[PDB]
Structure to design on (360 residues):
RNA sequence: AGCCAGGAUGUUGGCUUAGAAGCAGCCAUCAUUUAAAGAAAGCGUAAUAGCUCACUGGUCGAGUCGGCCUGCGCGGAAGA
RNA sequence: GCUCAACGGAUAAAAGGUACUCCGGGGAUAACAGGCUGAUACCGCCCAAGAGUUCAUAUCGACGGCGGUGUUUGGCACCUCGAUGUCGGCUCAUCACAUCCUGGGGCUGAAGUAGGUCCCAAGGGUAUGGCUGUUCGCCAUUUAAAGUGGUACGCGAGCUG
RNA sequence: GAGACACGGUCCAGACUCCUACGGGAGGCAGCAGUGGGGAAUAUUGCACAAUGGGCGCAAGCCUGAUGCAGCCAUGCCGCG
RNA sequence: UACCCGCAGAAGAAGCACCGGCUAACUCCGUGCCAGCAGCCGCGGUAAUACGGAGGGUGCAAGCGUUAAUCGGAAUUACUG
RNA sequence: GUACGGCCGCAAGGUUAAAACUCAAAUGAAUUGACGGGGGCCCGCACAAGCGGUGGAGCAUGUGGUUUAAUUCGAUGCAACGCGAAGAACCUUACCUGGUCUUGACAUCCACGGAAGUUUUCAGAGAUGAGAAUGUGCCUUCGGGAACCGUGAGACAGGUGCUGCAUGGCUGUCGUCAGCUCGUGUUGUGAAAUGUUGGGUUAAGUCCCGCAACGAGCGCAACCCUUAUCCUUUGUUGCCAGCGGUCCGGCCGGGAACUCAAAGGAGACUGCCAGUGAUAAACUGGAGGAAGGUGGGGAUGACGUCAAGUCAUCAUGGCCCUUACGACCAGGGCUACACACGUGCUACAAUGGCGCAUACAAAGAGAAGCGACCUCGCGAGAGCAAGCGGACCUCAUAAAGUGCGUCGUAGUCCGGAUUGGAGUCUGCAACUCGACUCCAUGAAGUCGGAAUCGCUAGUAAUCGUGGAUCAGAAUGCCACGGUG
RNA sequence: UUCUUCUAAAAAAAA
RNA sequence: GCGGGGUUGAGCAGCCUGGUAGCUCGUCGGGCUGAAAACCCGAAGAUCGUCGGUUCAAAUCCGGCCCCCGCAACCA
């Protein structure tokens, strides 16, 4: 919302002033660690605050211009000044958008988009198909490639769950805000009595994490131990050690092998099992982390968990995280997501700056 | 080889950095005062800075420096 | 006229078990232990890209290189098959230093306390229990410390089974 | 002791609190206020024996946190503004 | 002390719950199955007399609502029944 | 009727018998509908018997999807898909990109200055910026009076923006199916029932009889339009039976009979007869009659159903924009194209193609219009040009048919798609994106899978003609006749 | 002779 | 160490004596149903695990390799 963003920018301006004063004080540089972050804070804050201050002057200029138009018969000059002011206001807002554009390297990474049906059943499945088409057309518009990793089709059409990988530039940055539940208010195709039914769908956007690497076991890291094997076998089994226990000291994993009579074969088998166990532990840790992140991002599937609502009879799209209602639903359905995505990016960056200001 | 003095300049070279000045790092590494002085070899700072220093002059006034073909030696060299 | 193919062809005609075994031999030939060697094992050293905010060498050290010991698993079959008893435990030890503690010292990314690493030094000391036949290992609680090894992986004409 | 197996009487054992010269002692608010604690929650460490009543005394009189009052609380009932 | 007489001045003295039906008392604006209400039936999903605020109204009044607990309604342990 | 506990049993288990938690209901009988792969009776191209198609091919048109700056919006089972659109070059146009305006393109009111009106001039794609000639139609205490412009301020205008799930009006649909109700009375505590059911009958809840029902209303039939027969009035621009003439042409004197043109009337009502039937309603058959039981066709659509369709015909409550979601102009888009579907046109051929000769229509339209005749062009058409506001003149010679000739089962003398060259007409302007003509070119197609549609008589099938829309632009739509 | 299934939001009056 | 295997998206035939790729389920487009299944019609698909070698020609033949499935890894 415009009022909310202007309010945040004002608070940032106050923060910027406080940072300049704190920098001037020299107590922070004595601290050193405090000054370094504060100086970065100032760097990011100064450009946006300067732009905002200029915008503030422009808004004041518009108020005075309207007043000038009403009384001294200076209406013609005021109308031109006001018109110029409007042009300036629009240009400053585009500049603000540029200043608040995300600079994070992580944002550029490609992403996996999973759309799953929630409440509504086949209806929700159809909406999932609509959402997938929406995002696909948006990706196509911005020159991205969509690969359908997995698909589970609905009975009456649509997809019960479709997982796709989108590869491009700035995919994660552009699409991170879509995650969460999405509510669709419409008259279902499956319906025969013309009733309107509120249904919900859960979307998860996950960034493509760096490719898994299996590090080769380091000899110094391993602590091989040779000991006598248990069981039958006579003099040879008693004198020859024939059993190897390798403990990986960083991960604290112990593998014991006494199968073959040869120590070399026992050691080889133990090394293989140890490598598999480390690879399994890493893989499991990744799955647990991936599952937890997905679990948090995805909603419960109920109508209550929402981040966007699409009302089809009245053609209205509403964003719940930051207030914004748009009476469209056709342009947005046919790609053109930028109008919705951008205010969220700008607000998120402002929130991030505020969080950075508050970190101690 | 010691001793004494210097080793300034444009400019804090250009970047990017929250700072980058010789030093986190990427490219040049030019030019002047010309008895020489380095877009600087490092220490060092939180960056500058400060110190040693690549090079220039008196001093004592006889050799000095590191490569080649070779003989013989030193360390590397710890067990019941 | 024979895939008599085990191809100078034992017959035209034939598979297994022995820990219930047994005889004649071989250390001509294996398992234990000893011997030679050292691939493998363990411990060092040479060059220094890099980790260490800057800085290779405080501490580590990639890609590669050269050794020492006999020390794990081996390679060979030189000793023994007209008998060289073998894993672990108990009792009793003795030696080496590549030192676990105490002693002396250099550097430290050593403020102090407490540490890291290396050099010198074997005079003395170097746990008790739970689990398993266990060596090894994990765990509980101490200790200045709970060393690594050699001695037929010491020791059954001393004990166990 | 007429009446107790006796709240402010005796003895023993147990838990707790306090004094100690370490040998040994003292105590029991479920009396009136009152303090920590528990709980959603419940009051003042007040005045007087002037009246009623109890104990002693021949009586005057003394004692009575019983009792009569006062302080806090809209806790309830009733009346008025 | 109760009580009585005189002095100045309308000053020093009104709040709580509810209004879709049960249940007496209705409209407007913000929000769009969100925030929320609720003792039961049940409201709210961008025209809410049911949420929140305002105006108006209804019931009580130094009190007003909510909660806990018992009986009634419950002839829903019935002897009456 | 489960867990735990007790008792019984060889076991399966039996018997006695809770609690926590959860919901504001669970249940019984009966009533009105709806449904049954329940029963009985009846109807409709619903099935059966046939004819011709669609799905296969090319093209026209509409939709979904996709592409795009936009491919404008709406409809989407029957009841959307040759649908709104009864006609997209600009216009329409609501969409896109640019160039422009802010009391405005379109209304009312106020103030000021000009009558309006008229031709030209440069810049710009144009929208609108600049520039010269003209004038006065109204009354007169003639500071004024009507329109029609320009400037300023406002109240206001403006919206094909959203909500048909807030609506009016209008329409589809079950379905022209025969049903849907009410007043009073009665039965049941009551929702309800009866009437409206039953026996016959009908196309029909049409009619009769019976009957706790008696009546009434909206509907199912009739009254309305058209067609079929006859009579009276009227005979021109319509007709020619009898005559007189003819350039042989109803053409000209004429004639009012006939076709035909309208106006009025007659006629078809189970009216008559026989049989069946309940002495009824009614049904079957024939006599006359052009027509027999509703003679054929149409208009006519009950209470209601689908929150069906339309806020984009219009009107309208509320929400949204007011230097723009309003307004003007040029150019583009609605005509895009890997694909899928709906409705058609032309075909795959001999019941035919081509060439010549020849016969018979109906119903319409026409003044910014239909346009004879003659001349030119192979042709679409062009020039001159009478007649006609139309029973007169024009569109306009109907085609299939018939007679003759050729083709001889072939991707063909079938079929015309596609493409190149040259033109005509409309319109400021045929590139995207019109219709038609000439020459050349001659794809697929040899009767079509699963499936599916229309039709019971002048119907299906087939062949042409006209009209609305319209400056031009139909294979669609609405009518008309020929064979059948 | 066989012939299964259709989730999840509606609104209806008060002499 | 030894036998067998790798074939359209999945499970599997046939690799035959080296010139030649098949089935079921699945997939795509129509049809039925008001709609989704089931059903009907018409289609499509592979560099036969990897790399060298002998042929005119290798999925087939040879050799090496990777993965999968069995068998064995015993006397001390």
């Amino acid at each position: 919302m415009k009022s909310s963003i202007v309010a945040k920018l004002e608070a940032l301006h106050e923060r910027h002033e406080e940072v300049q004063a704190l920098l001037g004080d020299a107590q922070t540089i004595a601290d050193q660690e405090r000054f370094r972050a504060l100086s970065r804070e100032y760097a990011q804050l100064s450009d946006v605050s300067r732009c905002f201050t200029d915008w503030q002057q422009v808004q004041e200029d518009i108020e005075t211009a309207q007043m000038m138009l009403d009384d001294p018969e200076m209406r013609e000059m005021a109308q031109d000044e006001l018109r110029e002011a409007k042009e300036k206001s629009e240009q400053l807002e585009q500049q603000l958008q540029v200043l608040l554009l995300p600079k994070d390297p992580d944002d550029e990474r490609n992403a996996f988009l999973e759309v799953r049906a929630g409440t509504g059943g086949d209806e929700a499945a159809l909406f999932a198909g609509d959402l997938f088409r929406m995002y696909s057309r948006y990706a196509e518009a911005r020159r991205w490639r969509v690969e359908i990793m997995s698909a589970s089709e609905g009975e009456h059409g649509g997809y019960k769950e479709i997982i796709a990988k989108i590869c491009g530039d700035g995919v994660y940055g552009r699409l991170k805000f879509e995650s969460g539940g999405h509510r669709v208010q419409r008259v279902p195709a499956t319906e025969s009595q013309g009733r309107i039914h509120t249904s919900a769908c859960t979307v998860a956007v996950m960034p493509e994490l760096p490719d898994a690497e299996l590090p080769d076991i380091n000899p110094a890291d391993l602590r091989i131990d040779t000991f006598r094997s248990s069981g039958a076998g006579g003099q040879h089994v008693n004198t020859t050690d024939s059993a190897i226990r390798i403990t990986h000291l960083p991960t604290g994993i112990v593998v014991e092998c006494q199968d073959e009579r040869s120590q070399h074969k026992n050691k080889a088998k133990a090394l293989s099992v140890l490598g598999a166990r480390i690879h399994a532990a890493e893989m499991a840790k990744r799955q647990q982390a991936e599952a937890s992140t997905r679990r948090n991002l995805l909603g419960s599937g109920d109508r209550s968990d929402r981040n966007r609502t699409y009302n089809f009879p009245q053609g209205r799209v509403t964003d719940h995280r930051i207030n914004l209602t748009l009476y469209r639903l056709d342009e947005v359905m046919e790609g053109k997501l930028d109008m919705l995505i951008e205010p969220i990016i700008q607000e998120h960056q402002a929130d991030q700056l505020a969080a950075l200001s508050e970190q101690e």
